[PDB]
Design a protein around this ligand. Sequence first.
Ligand SMILES: COC(=O)[C@H](C)NC(=O)[C@H](C)NC(=O)[C@H](Cc1ccccc1)OP(=O)(O)[C@H](CC(C)C)NC(=O)[C@@H](NC(=O)[C@@H](NC(=O)CC(C)C)C(C)C)C(C)C
Length: 326
Amino acid sequence: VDEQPLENYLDMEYFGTIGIGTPAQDFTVVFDTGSSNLWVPSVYCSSLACTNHNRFNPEDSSTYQSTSETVSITYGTGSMTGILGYDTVQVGGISDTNQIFGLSETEPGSFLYYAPFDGILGLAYPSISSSGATPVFDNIWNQGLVSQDLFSVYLSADDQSGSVVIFGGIDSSYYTGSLNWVPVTVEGYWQITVDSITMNGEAIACAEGCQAIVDTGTSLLTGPTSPIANIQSDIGASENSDGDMVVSCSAISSLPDIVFTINGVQYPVPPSAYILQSEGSCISGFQGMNLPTESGELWILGDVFIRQYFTVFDRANNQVGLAPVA
Ligand SMILES: COC(=O)[C@H](C)NC(=O)[C@H](C)NC(=O)[C@H](Cc1ccccc1)OP(=O)(O)[C@H](CC(C)C)NC(=O)[C@@H](NC(=O)[C@@H](NC(=O)CC(C)C)C(C)C)C(C)C
């Protein structure tokens, strides 16, 4: 029953409306499985990005509780500092009482200024949460507000309406077949093993396995810079004059699927998904980024992947469920 509709912005970002405070002040937030903190802009913020986004006003809420603690969060794209406070967060028809969240003080740079969302609602594990702030979903579960300690995500394609986050439930209308269950390797991000990445029965990357995260907040398929450089040559991407990694739109019809094998099951990504149409030209859905951790350099299975596969995030059993979208 507890669905939260998400707006699809150019197949790059997905965000939904939440209410904070009594009475509710409305904000748009990216529902991000790559991070664990909830924050919104506030009146304490004087950064450029704070001036053109909705700002939380503590004085207007009858249920706001202040702390003396701060938070500092750095993302791949964007960063914030803020102060932690407690209030009621309305999300997915759930009144999430006594929720700790960040009230931004600084949001430096161009990225957050141009972004259509106000904040981020992190959906990963408490262990990666800045200042050890209780994530939203952990607080919902701890208060017995859902019955099933899971949430599932359907992300629409080609700017269509219909993207949803389902709290404490699955909807089998969104997928075909049955869910394939994959164990989380490390409890931080929603981290899994990718057995191999193949094209025409040949391993193009991750020949003996690699570590990947299932990240709703990342647009593209990202990996370490050297394996990605190989994937770019394999799909005929050339580096254009303006910074982009471009492919001829004509070529989509002749390229093979890139197959991600996960727990001995094949998950093909077609060239109509991994080659993106952005602003007249066609671009590679692969991005080179080095994200070093103690399990290796991480791959990100971003929105390119998730659009193809309905994704269930099971906290009861520490597993990810995958099935092809209907
Ligand atoms: C504890 O460890 C850490 O603290 C490190 C410093 N940071 C993190 O873990 C933080 C919380 N998470 C993170 O930083 C993780 C990635 C990550 C995963 C493991 C280790 C390192 C990074 O990214 P998120 O998904 O939360 C973020 C959400 C955005 C802002 C809406 N997305 C990102 O920052 C990614 N940005 C995007 O994909 C943006 N789009 C693009 O840049 C694509 C462009 C339009 C071609 C978004 C507008 C969709 C980049 C990674 C490309």
